[PDB]
Design a protein around this ligand. Sequence first.
Ligand SMILES: O=C([O-])C(=O)[O-]
Length: 8
Amino acid sequence: XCFXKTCT
Ligand SMILES: O=C([O-])C(=O)[O-]
């Protein structure tokens, strides 16, 4: 999904 200030 997403993490911190990035999403994948
Ligand atoms: O958890 C995740 O998928 C990431 O940090 O990209």
